[PDB]
Amino acid sequence: GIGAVFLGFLGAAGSTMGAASMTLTVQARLLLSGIVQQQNNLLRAPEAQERMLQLTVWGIKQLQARVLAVERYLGDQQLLGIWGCSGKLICCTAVPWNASWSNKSLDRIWNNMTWMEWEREIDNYTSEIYTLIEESQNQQEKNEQELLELD
Amino acid sequence: GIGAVFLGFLGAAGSTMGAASMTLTVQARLLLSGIVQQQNNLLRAPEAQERMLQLTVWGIKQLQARVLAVERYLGDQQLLGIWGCSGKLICCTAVPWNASWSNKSLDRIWNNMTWMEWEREIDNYTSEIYTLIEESQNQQEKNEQELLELD
Amino acid sequence: GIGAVFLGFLGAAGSTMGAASMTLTVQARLLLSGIVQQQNNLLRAPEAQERMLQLTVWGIKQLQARVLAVERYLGDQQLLGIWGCSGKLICCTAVPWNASWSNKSLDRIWNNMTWMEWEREIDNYTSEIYTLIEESQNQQEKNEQELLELD
Amino acid sequence: VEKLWVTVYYGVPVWKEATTTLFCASDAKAYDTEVHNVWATHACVPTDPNPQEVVLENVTEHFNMWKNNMVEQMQEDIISLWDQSLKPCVKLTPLCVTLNCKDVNMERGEIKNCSFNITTSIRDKVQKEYALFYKLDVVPIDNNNTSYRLISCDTSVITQACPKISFEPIPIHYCAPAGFAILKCNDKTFNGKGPCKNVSTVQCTHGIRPVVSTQLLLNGSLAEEEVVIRSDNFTNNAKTIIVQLKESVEINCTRPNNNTRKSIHIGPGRAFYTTGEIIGDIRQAHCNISRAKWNDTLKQIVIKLREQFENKTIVFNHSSGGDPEIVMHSFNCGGEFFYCNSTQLFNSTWNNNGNTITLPCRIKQIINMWQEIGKAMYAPPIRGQIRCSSNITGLLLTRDGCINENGTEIFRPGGGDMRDNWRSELYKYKVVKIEPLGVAPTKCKRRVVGR
Amino acid sequence: RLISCDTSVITQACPKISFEPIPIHYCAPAGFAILKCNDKTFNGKGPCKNVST
Amino acid sequence: MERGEIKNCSFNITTSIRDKVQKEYALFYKLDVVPIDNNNTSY
Amino acid sequence: VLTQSPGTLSLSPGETAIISCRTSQYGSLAWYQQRPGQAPRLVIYSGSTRAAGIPDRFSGSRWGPDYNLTISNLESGDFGVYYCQQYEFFGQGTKVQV
Ligand SMILES: *[C@@H]1O[C@H](CO)[C@@H](O[C@@H]2O[C@H](CO)[C@@H](O[C@@H]3O[C@H](CO[C@H]4O[C@H](CO[C@H]5O[C@H](CO)[C@@H](O)[C@H](O)[C@@H]5O)[C@@H](O)[C@H](O[C@H]5O[C@H](CO)[C@@H](O)[C@H](O)[C@@H]5O)[C@@H]4O)[C@@H](O)[C@H](O[C@H]4O[C@H](CO)[C@@H](O)[C@H](O)[C@@H]4O[C@H]4O[C@H](CO)[C@@H](O)[C@H](O)[C@@H]4O[C@H]4O[C@H](CO)[C@@H](O)[C@H](O)[C@@H]4O)[C@@H]3O)[C@H](O)[C@H]2NC(C)=O)[C@H](O)[C@H]1NC(C)=O
Ligand SMILES: *[C@@H]1O[C@H](CO)[C@@H](O[C@@H]2O[C@H](CO)[C@@H](O[C@@H]3O[C@H](CO[C@H]4O[C@H](CO)[C@@H](O)[C@H](O[C@H]5O[C@H](CO)[C@@H](O)[C@H](O)[C@@H]5O)[C@@H]4O)[C@@H](O)[C@H](O[C@H]4O[C@H](CO)[C@@H](O)[C@H](O)[C@@H]4O[C@H]4O[C@H](CO)[C@@H](O)[C@H](O)[C@@H]4O[C@H]4O[C@H](CO)[C@@H](O)[C@H](O)[C@@H]4O)[C@@H]3O)[C@H](O)[C@H]2NC(C)=O)[C@H](O)[C@H]1NC(C)=O
Ligand SMILES: *[C@@H]1O[C@H](CO)[C@@H](O[C@@H]2O[C@H](CO)[C@@H](O[C@@H]3O[C@H](CO[C@H]4O[C@H](CO[C@H]5O[C@H](CO)[C@@H](O)[C@H](O)[C@@H]5O[C@H]5O[C@H](CO)[C@@H](O)[C@H](O)[C@@H]5O)[C@@H](O)[C@H](O[C@H]5O[C@H](CO)[C@@H](O)[C@H](O)[C@@H]5O)[C@@H]4O)[C@@H](O)[C@H](O)[C@@H]3O)[C@H](O)[C@H]2NC(C)=O)[C@H](O)[C@H]1NC(C)=O
Ligand SMILES: *[C@@H]1O[C@H](CO)[C@@H](O[C@@H]2O[C@H](CO)[C@@H](O[C@@H]3O[C@H](CO[C@H]4O[C@H](CO[C@H]5O[C@H](CO)[C@@H](O)[C@H](O)[C@@H]5O[C@H]5O[C@H](CO)[C@@H](O)[C@H](O)[C@@H]5O)[C@@H](O)[C@H](O[C@H]5O[C@H](CO)[C@@H](O)[C@H](O)[C@@H]5O)[C@@H]4O)[C@@H](O)[C@H](O)[C@@H]3O)[C@H](O)[C@H]2NC(C)=O)[C@H](O)[C@H]1NC(C)=O
Ligand SMILES: *[C@@H]1O[C@H](CO)[C@@H](O[C@@H]2O[C@H](CO)[C@@H](O[C@@H]3O[C@H](CO)[C@@H](O)[C@H](O)[C@@H]3O)[C@H](O)[C@H]2NC(C)=O)[C@H](O)[C@H]1NC(C)=O
Ligand SMILES: *[C@@H]1O[C@H](CO)[C@@H](O[C@@H]2O[C@H](CO)[C@@H](O[C@@H]3O[C@H](CO)[C@@H](O)[C@H](O)[C@@H]3O)[C@H](O)[C@H]2NC(C)=O)[C@H](O)[C@H]1NC(C)=O
Ligand SMILES: *[C@@H]1O[C@H](CO)[C@@H](O[C@@H]2O[C@H](CO)[C@@H](O[C@@H]3O[C@H](CO)[C@@H](O)[C@H](O)[C@@H]3O)[C@H](O)[C@H]2NC(C)=O)[C@H](O)[C@H]1NC(C)=O
Ligand SMILES: *[C@@H]1O[C@H](CO)[C@@H](O[C@@H]2O[C@H](CO)[C@@H](O)[C@H](O)[C@H]2NC(C)=O)[C@H](O)[C@H]1NC(C)=O
Ligand SMILES: *[C@@H]1O[C@H](CO)[C@@H](O[C@@H]2O[C@H](CO)[C@@H](O)[C@H](O)[C@H]2NC(C)=O)[C@H](O)[C@H]1NC(C)=O
Ligand SMILES: *[C@@H]1O[C@H](CO)[C@@H](O)[C@H](O)[C@H]1NC(C)=O
Ligand SMILES: *[C@@H]1O[C@H](CO)[C@@H](O)[C@H](O)[C@H]1NC(C)=O
Ligand SMILES: *[C@@H]1O[C@H](CO)[C@@H](O)[C@H](O)[C@H]1NC(C)=O
Ligand SMILES: *[C@@H]1O[C@H](CO)[C@@H](O)[C@H](O)[C@H]1NC(C)=O
Ligand SMILES: *[C@@H]1O[C@H](CO)[C@@H](O)[C@H](O)[C@H]1NC(C)=O
Ligand SMILES: *[C@@H]1O[C@H](CO)[C@@H](O)[C@H](O)[C@H]1NC(C)=O
Ligand SMILES: *[C@@H]1O[C@H](CO)[C@@H](O)[C@H](O)[C@H]1NC(C)=O
C-alpha cells in the first residue's frame, strides 16, 4: 500500500517522525555499501587500468573517503553496541524521558514534527542523553555480573 | 565425529547444501581477520622497516586491498542488519518461498545440490529475493512503531 | 554510587576482575570511534587545507593506522560473531571450564586477580579455548539445520 | 501520556550542511576510445548508466552558490591534475637562448622567425636552429636589435605539454561518498542564494564540462524559463555578476593557417615541436557570431538587469584592464589558446525611449593558467588549421562603482578569478552529511521487569 | 657513440642493488581465494580434478 | 679569531639564461669553504 | 550619498559625543579616525562590531536609516577627524580639535 511499496533514499525528509519510522531501511541501508556495491560493480568495467601508474589524484580522494565512510559507519554501530541494542532501527531503553529535554507530548511529536526538525530541537541534549544510555548498560552489565557469580 | 572435528577452509565446496550447513564458521570466519591476524602477526617480524621510505609499490597493493576486504565484508554484515538478522549462519524470514524461484522440493535441495551449484540455479532471482526481505523488515518496522505509540 | 558514576578509560587496570566487570563500556567504547569522533571533530577546524598538496608524511601515518584500527576492531567483532554472541561485554557458552586451564576456584578469580593478571595466567590456553567455542557454535549450527529440514 | 522512555532509531532522514572529499565519474564513450592522455579522466570511475535521482517531498533547503566548497574543491582538483600531467612532459629550460628574430610577411610582426644555437641530444653539436614565434610569446632585449627572448624564460619554468595529451573538456560528475549526500535545486529560476522549493537527492551532479574561458561562458547549461542574473550583492561593485542564457548563441572560430610540425630534438629522448612552415596564405585568427543573435541576446539581459537595478538605462563597455587573459576572451579551440578582442560585443547603450561579427584573435603558446609560481606551459602547435564552434551559455560582468549623472551604470567583462566558472554550474547543488542515528521518546521500557 | 644515447635516457643501475631472482608468492586478500591444479599432467586449459585452496 | 673566517669570493656563473657568464662576488665562512692545491686565491 | 551629521564637534575630555550618518539604500557600515602623521584607523567593521584595540566605550547602536557611533569618556588621543564609510562611498567627516 504505502508501507509495503517503493519510497526512495531520504524520501521522508519532510515527512512526520511517525511516517519516517517505516522508511528506515531506505536510509539505514547504503550508509556503507551504498557505494561499495556500485564501486566494485562499475569499476570492473573493461578498463584493465584500475590503479595504473600506481596511485593518482583520484587515488587518495577515494581512499581518504573510502576509509572515512566505514569508520563513520562503524561509529554508529559502536553506539548500537555500547547501548546494548544493535537490533537497529528501533530500540527501547530503561533511560526514561527527561521532560527537560522536551516538555511536549507524544501526539504531536510523531505526527507533526519531522526528524530533521526534531533532532534540532533536541540537538543540545543528545550528548547528555547518549551518555545516560551508556550508564544504563553498565548498571545492567554489573547486575548481570553479580548474578553470574552466584548462578 | 564428523561435525565436531576438523574440516578446513572451503572444504565443503563439492559437498551437499545440507553438509555445508555445518561448516559455515569455517567460511564465515577469515572473511575478514583471515588476513589481519596473519598480517599483524607476521609483519611484526624483526625488520623495523615497516613502511620505510614511506609507502611503496606493495604499499598500495595492500591498502587498496586492505580497505576493500572490510567494506566487502561490511556489505554482507549490512545485509544481515537490514534483514534484521545478524545472528548469521542461519536465519528464517516471513518472506515465503516463491516456487517461481525453484519449483523443486526440499529432499533433493539439501542432499543433492551443492551451494556453488545451487546459488547458480537461483542467481537471477536473488536480486528480487533480497529486496523482498528488506520490505519484510520495514513492514515489521512500522508494525513495531505503531505499537510503540499506543504502548 | 560506584557503578553508576564516572570512572575513566582503563581505570580498572589494577582493579579485581569482578570490579572491572562493570567498567567494560569504558574500554569497550573508543576501540574504534575513540579517534574517529575526535579526528572528524578536530580536523574540521578552519584550516581548509585538509589533504593539501595531496598526501604527505602524516598522510600515511594516519591512513596506515586508520585502516588498522578498524580491522583490528572488526577482528574482535568477528569473534563475537563466530562465537554466536555479539551481545558483547558478557556472554555464556556451552564450552565448560577445563580446570586444566586453571584449577583455581571462583571466589578468588573475581575478587583477587585482575584481568591483566588473569589473562596472563591463561594466555597459553586461550588459543585452545577460543577454538572450542567455534566448534561449540558449529555443533549448534548443524543441530539447528537438522531441525530446519523436518520443521 | 504514559511512562515515556527514550527509544533510539537508526536510519532516520536527517542531515547537516557539510564538506568532504568528493570523487569523479567518467563517461562510457569517453573512456573506451583512447584519446590518449586527457586530464586525469582515466583515473575516475564510470558513471552509472541509470541517471538515478530521488525527489524530496515537503522540503525547502537553503542554497548559497557563493559559499559552496565544491568549487573550492573543483579548482583545487583542476589545478592538481594539470601539474601532475605535465610533471613528466618535456622541459624547455635550455631554450632560453638569445633569439635572433626577423619578422615574416595587425601587421606589427605578430608572427616572428627566430634563430638560436642549442646543444642537441648530445653535447657535441651546437646546431643553429630556426623557429617561429608569436609576438606575445616573445620579448625583446635592450635596443630593438634582431634579438628577442621567450616571454617568461628568465623568470619562469616553461614546460612543453606533450602533444599526446588533450585539453578536450570532458564533462564530469561529482559523485558523493557514503553517509553523505548531494542536493539539487530543481527550480527553474533560482536566485543563487536563498531557500529552494523543488529539492532532490542525487548521487552525482549533471555533466560539468570543465571548460575554462575568461569572458563568455561556453558550452554550459542554459536557463530554463527566462535568462537570469546572479550576484552575491549588487551594491558590492567588487563582485562578479553571472548571467545564464536561455538561448545559447553559437560562436564559430578558427586559426586559418595550415601549419607544419617540426621536431627539433633537444634530447636525449625528447624533442621540442614547432611550426616548420605555413602551407599557403598567412591569415588572422578570429571568431564569428551573429550580431543579431548576440544583441537580441543583449536584450534578454538588460531587461533582467533592470530588475536588479532601477529602470535606469544601461551601458556596456570594454574591460578596464588586466592581463591578456582577463582583458580578452580567452579559450582553447582545437588545442590552441585564443585571445579574442571583445570590444565589439561590449560597446552598447540600452534604453527604452544585416551582417555578422568578426572578433580578432591572437594565439599564444607559452601560457600560465591559474597564474602559477614561475611555472609556464608551452602548447606545441597543432598541425594544419583548426576550426571549432562554441555555445555561449552566459558570461561575467563587473560594475563600475562610482555612479554618475549621465552614467548611468557600466558593466564590463569580468573574469579575474576562476572560481566562478564552477559556480556558474555548481550553483544548483550542495553537499550534506547524513546522520542516521536519532533518539526519540515512545512509551516502551527495556523489558527488564523480570530477569 | 653510445648505443642509444641520442634516442634514450640511460640510467646506471646502482651497484648496491642486486638482480638476484628471489622466489615469490602471491598471497591473496580477504574474501578472495587462489586455487591450484594439483594434477600431474595438466593441459593448461580445461577442467581440473585434483583442486585445492 | 682573525684567520679569515669571513671570506669574499668571486666566480663565474651562467644566469637564468645560457647567454650570460656573469662574474659574481659573494661572501662565505672559512668553515663553509675549502682551498685547492697551493693556497692561492682559490677555494 | 552619506550624510554625516553634525559638523562642529568640540568638547572636553570629561564629556561624551555621538556622530550620526544617513543613507538612502542599505549597506555595510564602518568608521575611522585620523591622527597627526597617522592615516585613518578602523574602529567599526559591521556597525555593531568593533575593531582591534577598541574598548566597550565605542557603542554602535541603531537599526534604522540613522546610524550612530558613540565614544563616551573622551581622551587626548581622540582628537582628529572621523568618517563613515559604506561600500565605495564616504561620509562628509568631522574634525575634533584642542
Ligand atoms: C564547445 O563544444 C564544441 C563541440 O564539442 C567544441 O568544438 C569541438 O572542439 C574539438 C576540439 O577542440 C573538436 O574535436 C577535434 O576535431 C579535430 C578535427 O576533426 C577531424 O574529424 C572530422 C570528421 O570527424 C571524423 O572523426 C571523428 C573523431 O574525431 C569521428 O567521430 C567522425 O565519425 C569522423 O570520422 C574532419 O572533418 C576533420 O577535418 C578534416 O577534413 C577537413 C576537410 O573537410 C580538412 O581541412 C582537415 O584537415 C581534416 O582532414 C578532422 O579530420 C580532430 O583532429 C580531433 O581529434 C584529435 O585528437 C584526438 C585525441 O588526441 C585524436 O585521437 C585524434 O586522432 C586527433 O589527434 C591527431 O589527429 C589530428 C588530425 O586529425 C592532429 O591535428 C593531431 O595533432 C593529432 O595528431 C597526432 O596523432 C596522429 C595519429 O592520429 C599522429 O600521426 C601525429 O603524429 C600526432 O601524434 C578532435 O576530434 C570538435 O570537432 C569540435 N566540434 C565542433 C562542432 O566544432 C568547442 O571547442 C567547445 N568550446 C570550448 C571553449 O571548449
Ligand atoms: C546586500 O543587499 C541586501 C539587499 O538586497 C541587503 O540586505 C538588507 O539590509 C537591510 C539593512 O542592512 C536589512 O534591514 C531592513 O531594514 C528595514 C528598516 O525598516 C524599519 O525602520 C524604518 C525606519 O526606522 C521604519 O520606517 C520601518 O517601518 C516602521 O515605521 C513606520 C513609520 O511610519 C511605520 O509606519 C511602519 O508601520 C513600521 O512600524 C521599519 O520599522 C526593515 O523594515 C526591513 O524589513 C524587515 O521588516 C519588514 C516589516 O517591516 C519585513 O516585511 C521584512 O521582511 C524585513 O523583515 C526582517 O525580519 C524578518 C524576520 O526576522 C526576516 O524574515 C527578514 O528577512 C528581515 O530580516 C532582517 O532582520 C533579521 C532580524 O533577525 C536579520 O536577522 C536579517 O539578517 C535581516 O536583517 C529590514 O529589516 C534587510 O533585511 C536586508 N535584506 C533585504 C532583503 O532587504 C544587505 O545589507 C546587503 N549586504 C549583504 C552583505 O547582504
Ligand atoms: C623598440 O620598440 C619600443 C616599442 O615600440 C620603443 O619603445 C619606446 O622607447 C622610447 C625610448 O626613448 C620611448 O620614447 C619616449 O618618447 C617620448 C615622446 O613620445 C611622444 O611622442 C611619440 C611620437 O609618436 C608619434 O609619431 C609617430 C610617427 O612619427 C606615430 O606613429 C605616433 O602615433 C605618434 O603620433 C602622434 O603624435 C604626433 C606628434 O608626435 C602627432 O603629429 C600625430 O598626429 C599623433 O597624434 C608618441 O608616440 C608618444 O605617445 C605616447 O605618450 C602618450 C602620452 O603623451 C600616450 O597617450 C600614448 O599612448 C603613447 O604612450 C608621445 O606622445 C619622449 O619624451 C621620451 O623621452 C622617450 O624618448 C617610448 O615611450 C617607448 N614606447 C613604448 C610604447 O614603450 C623603442 O623606442 C624601440 N627601440 C628601438 C631601438 O627601436
Ligand atoms: C696553506 O695553509 C695550510 C694550513 O694553514 C698549510 O698546510 C701546511 O702544509 C705544509 C706543507 O709542507 C705542512 O708543512 C710541514 O711542516 C713540517 C714541519 O712543521 C713543523 O714546524 C711548524 C713551524 O711552525 C712554527 O712557526 C710558526 C711561525 O713561524 C708558528 O706560528 C707555529 O706555531 C710554529 O711555532 C712553534 O714552533 C717553532 C719552531 O718551529 C717554535 O719556535 C715556536 O715557539 C712554536 O713552538 C709547526 O707549525 C709544526 O707544528 C705541527 O706539528 C706538531 C707536531 O710536531 C703539532 O703538534 C702541531 O699542532 C702542528 O700540527 C711542526 O712542528 C715539515 O716537516 C713537513 O715536511 C711539512 O713541510 C704543514 O704541516 C701543513 N699544516 C697543516 C695544518 O696542515 C699550507 O702550507 C699552506 N700553503 C700555502 C701555499 O700557503
Ligand atoms: C530526569 O528525570 C529524573 C527521573 O527519571 C528526575 O529525578 C527525579 O526528580 C524529581 C524532581 O522532579 C525528584 O524529586 C521529587 O519530585 C516530586 C515533584 O516533582 C515530589 O513529589 C517528590 O517528593 C520529590 O520532590 C526525584 O527524587 C528525582 N529522582 C531521583 C531518583 O533522584 C531528574 O530530576 C530529571 N532531571 C532533569 C534534568 O530533567
Ligand atoms: C509469490 O508467492 C505469493 C504468495 O506467497 C504469490 O501470491 C499469490 O499467488 C496466487 C496465484 O498463484 C494468487 O491467487 C490465488 O491462486 C489460487 C490457485 O493458484 C486460487 O485458488 C486463488 O483463488 C487465487 O487465484 C494469490 O492471491 C496471491 N497472493 C497475494 C497475497 O497476492 C505470488 O503470485 C508469487 N509470485 C511469484 C512470481 O511466484
Ligand atoms: C576438559 O573437560 C572435559 C569434560 O568437560 C574432559 O572430558 C572428560 O574427562 C574425564 C577425565 O577427567 C573422562 O573420564 C572420566 O573421569 C572420571 C574421573 O575423572 C571417572 O569417574 C570416569 O569413569 C571417567 O574415567 C570423561 O570421559 C571425559 N569426557 C568426555 C566426553 O570425553 C576433558 O578430559 C578435559 N580436558 C582437559 C585437557 O582438561
Ligand atoms: C525609461 O528609461 C529611463 C532611463 O532612460 C528610466 O528612468 C529611470 O527611472 C528610474 C525609476 O523608474 C530612476 O530610478 C532612474 O534614475 C531613471 N534614470 C534615468 C536615466 O532617467 C524610466 O523609468 C524608464 N521608463 C519605463 C516606463 O520603463
Ligand atoms: C555624459 O554626459 C556628461 C554631461 O552631462 C558628459 O560629461 C563630461 O565628461 C567629460 C569627460 O569625458 C568631462 O571632461 C566633462 O567636464 C563632462 N561635462 C559635463 C557637462 O559634465 C559625459 O561625457 C557624457 N558621457 C558620454 C558617454 O557621452
Ligand atoms: C513547553 O514549555 C514552553 C515554555 O518553556 C511552552 O511555551 C510550550 O508551550 C510548552 N510545550 C508544551 C507542549 O506544553
Ligand atoms: C508542531 O507543533 C508545534 C506546536 O504544537 C509547533 O511549534 C511546530 O512548529 C509544529 N511543527 C510543524 C512542522 O509545523
Ligand atoms: C520444474 O519444472 C521443470 C519445467 O519447467 C521440470 O522439467 C522440472 O522437472 C521441475 N522440477 C520439479 C522438481 O518438479
Ligand atoms: C540433483 O537432482 C536434479 C534432478 O533431481 C539434477 O538436475 C541435478 O543435476 C542433481 N545434482 C547433482 C549434483 O547431480
Ligand atoms: C593448582 O595446582 C597447583 C599445583 O600444580 C597448586 O600449587 C595450586 O595451589 C592449585 N590451586 C588451587 C586453587 O588449588
Ligand atoms: C590471588 O591469590 C593467589 C593465591 O590464592 C595468588 O597466587 C595471587 O598472587 C593473588 N593475586 C594477587 C593480585 O595478589
Ligand atoms: C617579409 O619578411 C621575409 C623574411 O624572410 C622576407 O623574405 C620578405 O621579403 C618580406 N616581405 C616583403 C614584402 O618584403
Residue D39 CA to residue D24 CA, distance in Å, equals 12
3-state secondary structure of F17: coil
| Ligand 10 centroid distance, CA of A22 (Å) | 28
SS (H, E, C) chain G: CCEEECCCCCCCCCCCCEEEEECCCCCCEEECCCCCCCCCCCCECCCCCECCCCCCCEEECCCCCCEEEEECCCCHHHCEEECEEECCEECCCEEECC
Residue D349 CA to residue D386 CA, distance in Å, equals 35
Calculate the dihedral angle through the C-alpha atoms of D437, D438, D443, D449, rounding to the nearest 10 degrees. 40
Q: b/e for D389-403, b at 16 or more Cβ within 10 A?
A: ebbbbbbbbbbbeee
Residue A129 CA to residue D6 CA, distance in Å, equals 9
3-state secondary structure of D281: coil
D118 and D183 belong to one structural domain = no
Residue D363 CA to residue D378 CA, distance in Å, equals 12
Residue F16 CA to residue D94 CA, distance in Å, equals 9
Q: Does A121 touch chain C (CB under 8 A)?
A: no
Q: Does B131 touch chain A (CB under 8 A)?
A: no
Could you tell me how far CA F11 lies from the centroid of its own chain? 6
Residue D153 CA to residue D139 CA, distance in Å, equals 10
Contacts of D290 (CB under 8 A, 6+ apart): D249, D250, D356, D357
Q: Are C28 and C10 in contact (CB under 8 A)?
A: no
Q: How many CB atoms lie within 10 A of CB D239?
A: 16
3-state secondary structure of D241: strand
Q: Are C3 and C20 in contact (CB under 8 A)?
A: no
Q: Are A125 and A97 in contact (CB under 8 A)?
A: no
Grid cell listed for B129: 529475493
Which stretch of DSSP H or E encloses residue C75? helix C57-82
Q: Compute the C-alpha angle C36/C41/C43, nearest 5°.
A: 95
Q: Does D282 touch chain B (CB under 8 A)?
A: no
What's the CATH code of the domain at G11? Answer: 2.60.40.10
Q: Are D130 and D114 in contact (CB under 8 A)?
A: yes
The closest alpha carbon to C21, from A78, A138, A93, A86, belongs to A138
State chain B's maximal CA–CA distance in angstroms. Answer: 64
D108 lines ligand 3 (CB under 6 A): no
Rounded to the nearest 10 degrees, what angle do helices A57-82 and C57-82 cross at? 40
The closest alpha carbon to D243, from D398, D50, D19, belongs to D398
DSSP chain A: --SSS---TTGGGGSBHHHHTT-HHHHHSSSSSTTHHHHHHHHTSTT--TTTTS--HHHHHHHHHHHHHHHHHHHHHHHHHHTT--S-S-EEEEEE--TTT----HHHHHHT-BHHHHHHHTTTTHHHHHHHHHHHHHHHHHHHHHHHHH-
Residue A122 CA to residue A103 CA, distance in Å, equals 11
Residue with cell 551532479: D205
Contacts of D173 (CB under 8 A, 6+ apart): D24, D25, D47, D204, D205, D206, D207, D208
Rounded to the nearest 10 degrees, what angle do helices D69-86 and D419-426 cross at? 130
C-alpha distances (whole Å) from D316 to each of C102, D214, D307, D342 are 93, 17, 16, 11
Q: How many CB atoms lie within 10 A of CB A23?
A: 24
Q: Are A12 and A19 in contact (CB under 8 A)?
A: yes
Q: Please state the domain count of chain G.
A: 1
Exposure on the CB side of residue D232, measured as CA atoms within 13 A: 12
Residue with cell 564458521: B25
Residue D167 CA to residue D37 CA, distance in Å, equals 9
Within 6 Å (CB) of ligand 7, which residues are found?
Answer: C 96, 98, 100
**Chain B closest-CA separation from residue D4 CA (Å):** 9
Resolution reading in Å? 3.1
Contact exists between F and C (3 or more beta carbon pairs < 8 Å): no
Grid cell listed for D181: 549526500
Single-letter residue type at G25: Q
Grid cell listed for D90: 618535456
Residue with cell 613528466: D88
Strand partners for D228: D244
Residue B118 CA to residue B112 CA, distance in Å, equals 10
For a ligand 6 pocket test, name from B93, B97, B98, B124 the mutation site with the most ligand atoms within 8 angstroms of its C-beta.
Answer: B98
- Say whether B149 and D442 touch across the interface (CB within 8 A): yes
D288 and D261 belong to one structural domain = no
D406 lines ligand 9 (CB under 6 A): yes
DSSP D314-348: EEE-------HHHHSEEEEETTEEEEE-TTTTS-E
Single-letter residue type at D240: T
Could you tell me how far CA D140 lies from the centroid of its own chain? 31
Single-letter residue type at D213: S
D218 and D366 belong to one structural domain = yes
D443 chain-A contacts, CB cut-off 8 A: 106
Exposure on the CB side of residue D111, measured as CA atoms within 13 A: 16
Long-range (24+ apart) CB contacts under 8 A made by A2-5 are A3/B138, A3/B139, A3/B142, A4/B135, A4/B138, A4/B139
CB contacts under 8 A, B 6-25 vs C, are 18, 21-25
Grid cell listed for D63: 542554497
Q: Please state the domain count of chain B.
A: 1
B96 lines ligand 6 (CB under 6 A): yes
The closest alpha carbon to B63, from A76, G11, A51, G78, belongs to A51
Rounded to the nearest 10 degrees, what angle do helices B36-43 and C57-82 cross at? 130
Q: Are B57 and A54 in contact (CB under 8 A)?
A: yes
Q: Does C134 touch chain B (CB under 8 A)?
A: yes
Domain region containing D196 = 14-20+48-65+175-205+428-435
Could you tell me how far CA D122 lies from the centroid of its own chain? 41
Can you say whether residue A70 is alpha, beta or left, with left for phi > 0 and alpha for psi between -120 and 50 degrees? alpha
- Say whether B66 and C67 touch across the interface (CB within 8 A): yes
D442 chain-B contacts, CB cut-off 8 A: 145, 148-149
D269 and D376 belong to one structural domain = no
D228 and D304 belong to one structural domain = yes
Q: How many CB atoms lie within 10 A of CB G88?
A: 15
Contacts of C16 (CB under 8 A, 6+ apart): C110, C111, C112, C113, C114
C127 lines ligand 14 (CB under 6 A): no
D101 and D240 belong to one structural domain = no
Grid cell listed for D343: 570590444
Considering every ligand atom shown, identify the ligand nearest to the alpha carbon of residue D233 and give its number. 2
The closest alpha carbon to D133, from D159, D92, D102, D157, belongs to D102
Q: Are D169 and D209 in contact (CB under 8 A)?
A: yes
Q: Are D305 and D314 in contact (CB under 8 A)?
A: yes
| B81, B135, B148: residue with CB nearest A88 | B81
Single-letter residue type at C31: L
Residue A9 CA to residue C131 CA, distance in Å, equals 42
Grid cell listed for E41: 599432467
Which stretch of DSSP H or E encloses residue D191? none
Residue C42 CA to residue E14 CA, distance in Å, equals 45
Residue C81 CA to residue C141 CA, distance in Å, equals 13
Strands D241-264 vs D228-230: parallel, antiparallel or unpaired? antiparallel
- Say whether D7 and B148 touch across the interface (CB within 8 A): yes
The one-character DSSP state at D41 is G
| Ligand 14 centroid distance, CA of C102 (Å) | 8
**Length, in residues, of chain G:** 98
Residue with cell 536609516: G65
Which stretch of DSSP H or E encloses residue D6? strand D5-10
Domain region containing G90 = 1-98
Nearest CA to ligand 13 atom 1: B112
- Say whether D154 and F16 touch across the interface (CB within 8 A): yes
Residue D256 CA to residue D278 CA, distance in Å, equals 10
SS (H, E, C) D368-421: CHHHCCCEEEECCCCCEEEEEEEEEEEEEEEECCCCCCCCCCEEEECCCCCHHH
Q: How many CB atoms lie within 10 A of CB E21?
A: 6
Q: Report the helix count and the strand count for chain F, using DSSP H and E.
A: 0, 2
The one-character DSSP state at C13 is G
Domain region containing A123 = 1-151
Residue D376 CA to residue D155 CA, distance in Å, equals 10
Q: Are D294 and D357 in contact (CB under 8 A)?
A: yes
| Ligand 3 centroid distance, CA of D278 (Å) | 33
Q: Are D252 and D287 in contact (CB under 8 A)?
A: yes
DSSP D196-207: -SSEEEESS-S-
C-alpha distances (whole Å) from D189 to each of B51, C49, D248, D304, E32 are 54, 34, 17, 12, 52
The one-character DSSP state at D119 is E
Q: Chain B residue closest to A62 (CA)?
A: B64
Q: How many CB atoms lie within 10 A of CB D143?
A: 6
Grid cell listed for D52: 538515478
Grid cell listed for C92: 555464556
Q: Does D235 touch chain G (CB under 8 A)?
A: yes
DSSP E1-53: --TTTTTS------TTS------------TT----EE--SS--SSS--SSEE-
Exposure on the CB side of residue C71, measured as CA atoms within 13 A: 29
Which candidate in B68, B77, B114, B116 is best for mutational testing of the E interface (most E CBs within 10 A)?
B68
Residue D247, in any domain of the structure: yes
- Index of the ligand 12 atom closest to the CA of residue B102: 1
Contacts of D434 (CB under 8 A, 6+ apart): A10, A27, A31, D14, D15, D179, D180, D181
**Length, in residues, of chain B:** 151
**Length, in residues, of chain F:** 43
Contacts of D343 (CB under 8 A, 6+ apart): D318
Grid cell listed for A133: 544510555
SS (H, E, C) B20-83: HCCCHHHHHCCCCCCCHHHHHHHHCCCCCCCCCCCCCHHHHHHHHHHHHHHHHHHHHHHHHHHC
Contact exists between C and G (3 or more beta carbon pairs < 8 Å): no
Residue C137 CA to residue C84 CA, distance in Å, equals 7
Grid cell listed for E16: 648496491
Calculate the dihedral angle through the C-alpha atoms of B47, B52, B57, B59, rounding to the nearest 10 degrees. 80
Which candidate in D93, D95, D96, D118 is best for mutational testing of the F interface (most F CBs within 10 A)?
D96
The closest alpha carbon to G87, from D403, D404, D304, belongs to D403
The closest alpha carbon to D357, from D217, D447, D253, D282, belongs to D253
Grid cell listed for C12: 580498572
Contact exists between E and G (3 or more beta carbon pairs < 8 Å): no
Residue A97 CA to residue D6 CA, distance in Å, equals 5
D142 lines ligand 3 (CB under 6 A): no
Nearest CA to ligand 11 atom 9: A113
Single-letter residue type at G73: N
Q: Compute the C-alpha angle D336/D339/D341, nearest 5°.
A: 150
Q: Does D54 touch chain A (CB under 8 A)?
A: yes
The one-character DSSP state at D88 is S
